[PDB]
C-alpha cells in the first residue's frame, strides 16, 4: 500500500508519455532509494517495449476504448494477466500495458483517461499486487534482479 | 475466438513470463560471486 506504488506509476507513465512527445501534469543493499526503483522500471519497460511493442499496437481500437468503457476493459485485462499468478515480468507487462493505454488514449484525444488510468494502476498495485511484492522482497528485490 | 480483453491479457502473460524467465536466467548464469 505505501505511497511508493503511486510514485512508480506516475513516474512510469510520465516517462512513456515523454517518449511520445507529451508532457503530463502528473496530477489527480537491503534498502534502496525509490529513484533507483523508478530507473530500473523505466529500463525494464523500455527493454520490454523494444522486444514486444507489436503486442501493444492500437490497443484503443482493439479494446474499443472510450471513457465509459475504459475502466472495465483495463480491469479485465489486468485481472486475467494475474489470474494464475504474479511475477516481476508480468508486473513489467502491467506497467507497459498501462503506459501504452495512456499514450494511445492521448493519441485519440482521450487525454482525460491518463489520470484515471494512473489511479486504476495505483489501486491495483496497492490492493492486489502489494501483498505479493512485499512477500517477494519488495521493489528493492525487483531492482536487484532487473537493475 | 477470444474476446479482445482476454486475447491481449494472455499475450501480455506469455511475453511477461518470457521476459521474467530471461532475467531469472541471467541471475543464475552469473552468480558465481
From Swiss-Prot, chain A:
A GO cellular component annotated for this chain's UniProt record is: mitochondrial outer membrane
Name the tissues where it is expressed: Widely expressed, with highest levels in the brain, thymus, bone marrow, and kidney. Bcl-X(L) and Bcl-X(delta-TM) expression is enhanced in B- and T-lymphocytes that have been activated.
Motif extent (BH4): 4-24
User: According to its UniProt record, where is this protein mainly located?
Assistant: mitochondrion
Give the membrane topology: Single-pass membrane protein
What UniProt keywords apply to this chain's record, in alphabetical order?
Apoptosis, Cytoplasm, Cytoplasmic vesicle, Cytoskeleton, Membrane, Mitochondrion, Mitochondrion inner membrane, Mitochondrion outer membrane, Nucleus, Phosphoprotein, Synapse, Transmembrane, Transmembrane helix, Ubl conjugation
> Which superkingdom is the protein from?
Eukaryota
Where is it localised?
A: Mitochondrion membrane; Nucleus membrane; Cytoplasm, Cytoskeleton, Microtubule organizing center, Centrosome
As for PTM, the annotation reads:
Proteolytically cleaved by caspases during apoptosis. The cleaved protein, lacking the BH4 motif, has pro-apoptotic activity.
Entry's Gene Ontology BP terms: apoptotic process; apoptotic process in bone marrow cell; cellular response to alkaloid; cellular response to amino acid stimulus; cellular response to gamma radiation; defense response to virus; dendritic cell apoptotic process; dendritic cell proliferation
Gene Ontology molecular function? BH3 domain binding; identical protein binding; protein kinase binding
Give residue numbers for sequence motif BH1. Answer: 80-99
Location of motif BH2 in this chain is 131-146
Q: Where is this motif: BH3?
A: 37-51
Q: Tell me the protein family, please.
A: Belongs to the Bcl-2 family.
Self-association state and partner proteins as the record states: Homodimer. Interacts with BAD. Interacts with PGAM5. Interacts with HEBP2. Interacts with p53/TP53 and BBC3; interaction with BBC3 disrupts the interaction with p53/TP53. Interacts with ATP5F1A and ATP5F1B; the interactions mediate the association of isoform Bcl-X(L) with the mitochondrial membrane ATP synthase F(1)F(0) ATP synthase. Interacts with VDAC1. Interacts with BCL2L11 (via BH3). Interacts with RNF183. Interacts with GIMAP3/IAN4 and GIMAP5/IAN5. Interacts with GIMAP5 and HSPA8/HSC70; the interaction between HSPA8 and BCL2L1 is impaired in the absence of GIMAP5.
- What exactly does this protein do? Potent inhibitor of cell death. Inhibits activation of caspases. Appears to regulate cell death by blocking the voltage-dependent anion channel (VDAC) by binding to it and preventing the release of the caspase activator, CYC1, from the mitochondrial membrane. Also acts as a regulator of G2 checkpoint and progression to cytokinesis during mitosis.
Domain free text = The BH4 motif is required for anti-apoptotic activity. The BH1 and BH2 motifs are required for both heterodimerization with other Bcl-2 family members and for repression of cell death.
Q: What name goes with this protein?
A: Bcl-2-like protein 1
State the organism named in the record.
Answer: Mus musculus
Could you tell me the gene encoding this protein?
Bcl2l1
What part of the full protein is here? 1 to 196 of 233
UniProtKB/Swiss-Prot annotation, chain B:
Signals that turn on the gene: By ER stress.
Compartment(s) of residence? Membrane; Mitochondrion
List the expressing tissues.
Expressed in a number of B- and T-lymphoid cell lines.
Positions occupied by motif BH3: 8-22
State the post-translational modifications.
Deubiquitination catalyzed by USP27X stabilizes the protein.
Please explain the role this protein plays, according to its UniProt record: Induces apoptosis and anoikis. The isoforms vary in cytotoxicity with isoform BimS being the most potent and isoform BimEL being the least potent.
What is said about the domains?
The BH3 motif is required for the interaction with Bcl-2 proteins and cytotoxicity.
Q: What family name appears in the similarity comment? A: Belongs to the Bcl-2 family.
Subunit text: Forms heterodimers with a number of antiapoptotic Bcl-2 proteins, including MCL1, BCL2, BCL2L1 isoform Bcl-X(L), BCL2A1/BFL-1, and BCL2L2/BCLW. Interacts with BAX (in vitro); this interaction may induce the conformationally active form of BAX. Does not heterodimerize with proapoptotic proteins such as BAD, BOK or BAK. Identified in a complex containing BCL2L11, DYNLL1 and BCL2L1 isoform Bcl-X(L); BH3 integrity is required for BCL2L1-binding. Interacts with YWHAZ. When phosphorylated, interacts with TRIM2; this interaction is associated with ubiquitination and degradation.
> Which protein are we looking at?
Bcl-2-like protein 11
Record the organism. Answer: Mus musculus (Mouse)
* Gene name as annotated: Bcl2l11
